[PDB]
Amino acid sequence: MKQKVVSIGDINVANDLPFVLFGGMNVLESRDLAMRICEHYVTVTQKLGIPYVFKASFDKANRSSIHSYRGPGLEEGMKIFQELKQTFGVKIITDVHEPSQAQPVADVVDVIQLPAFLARQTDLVEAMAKTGAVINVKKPQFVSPGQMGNIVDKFKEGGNEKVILCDRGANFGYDNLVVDMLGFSIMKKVSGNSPVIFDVTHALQCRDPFGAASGGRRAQVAELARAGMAVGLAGLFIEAHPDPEHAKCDGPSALPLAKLEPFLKQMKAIDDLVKGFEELDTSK
Ligand SMILES: O=P(O)(O)CN(CC(O)O)C[C@@H](O)[C@@H](O)[C@H](O)[C@H](O)COP(=O)(O)O
């Protein structure tokens, strides 16, 4: 069949419609810190005719505590969207954490998210259901692709239907992740041909590192982000920062802000012909 299409503005994501770019950075460090990041992405998109949605997060939840750089916080967090927002009128995306706030957030932003850890959590699947917006599903590293119909079905069961599926790799042995480029279709099928998007950033982090033959970071984001692209996805997901990030030079992994352009050009040419190629198959 053809692929379902959740429409994010003049941007329409679809497994046959060009790899939409879902850029951003990690923890929302500073109202203007971001600009460097918005502005610099914004450009490259249009220069290369890649669509753009901006990824941004406002809270802690994950890692260091009691406050340990807990993120801008809701109240003053949402404010900062509205600036990058109109400054270039942009489609943004924020992960929520606990139900209540599944309405505030769902205002200044375009593509709300449901963090891996509360994936199969129901009451947030609902608290967003009581919204009807564009949701992004963070596919847990412990779930078989085949289990994505049990996050989607129920979303629709929540009234909300406008769903998206994001893959962050899956775990492989203690502390390490991997991706099976063969898990993208399986997710397509089990999930009403919903768009399938690759979080190239979180994904390979524990991947680059498999201690011994690694033990000091190092990066290969495009190298892996081209695999996604040559299988045929809806689009990518990446986070950047000048010198890597404050929340990615220690958190997970990231991408050099101004190295970003020829990355996409790799991802545009590669995608280019793949989204071209007239549908084939080898089950006969
Ligand atoms: O399983 P998840 O992706 O929800 C959590 N992990 C998976 C991993 O590779 O350890 C991903 C990120 O959320 C985590 O790396 C980040 O470092 C954390 O959220 C924030 O870090 P920081 O800004 O320095 O306070």
Swiss-Prot record:
Keyword Transferase applies: yes
EC number: 2.5.1.55
Keyword annotations: Cytoplasm, Lipopolysaccharide biosynthesis, Transferase
Keyword match rRNA processing: no
InterPro entries (alphabetical): Aldolase_TIM (IPR013785), DAHP1/KDSA (IPR006218), KDO8P_synthase (IPR006269)
Localization terms from the record: Cytoplasm
Assembly and binders: Homotrimer.
Protein role: Synthesis of KDO 8-P which is required for lipid A maturation and cellular growth.
Protein name: 2-dehydro-3-deoxyphosphooctonate aldolase
Species whose genome carries this gene: Escherichia coli (strain K12)
